[PDB]
Structure 1
Amino acid sequence: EGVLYVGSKTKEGVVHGVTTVAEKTKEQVTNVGGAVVTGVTAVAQKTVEGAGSIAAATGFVKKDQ
């Protein structure tokens, strides 16, 4: 149950979403957990129903080693 309205009157638009530049790096991590929605009129919905939901988002893990 719900209603979402978007209206965009744009004459000129320049959009960037997730950008990453790595030079001479080691172990660069760009990590996104949900959707990546990008645009002059970007809309995103998400409905997680159900008890006990988990939404993890880790860059990295190092164990023992």
Structure 2
Amino acid sequence: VLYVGSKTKEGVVHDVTTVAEKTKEQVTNVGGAVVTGVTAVAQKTVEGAGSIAAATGFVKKD
């Protein structure tokens, strides 16, 4: 294997633009999960027999 004058991207996020002008929110969470932001996960490898990689709003409850 060899790379000459090249590039690679094995899991990336970019150019995430967010313009929020004159907003209003009123969240009233009482249990559980409310996720109203801007998230950006970027992984290369997640092994493991049960891994819950990259969760956003998870309520895993017995």
Q: Please, which runs of 5 or more residues in structure 2 have no aligned partner? A: none
1:53 CA drift (Å):
0.7
User: Secondary structure, in 3 states, of the residue corresponding to 1:29?
Assistant: coil
Larger strand proportion of the pair: 1
In the comparison of the two structures, how many residue pairs are matched? Answer: 62
Question: Which consecutive unaligned segments of at least 5 residues does structure 1 have?
Answer: none
The two structures, once aligned, show a CA RMSD in angstroms of 10.8
Q: Normalising by the residue count of structure 2, what TM-score does the alignment of the two structures yield?
A: 0.35
Cα-to-partner distance string for 1:5-64 (whole Å, 9 max, x where unaligned): 696599999996100000111249999999999999999761111111103443699999
**TM-score, L = length of structure 1:** 0.33
- Higher relative contact order, structure no. (Cα contacts within 8 Å, ≥ 6 residues apart): 2
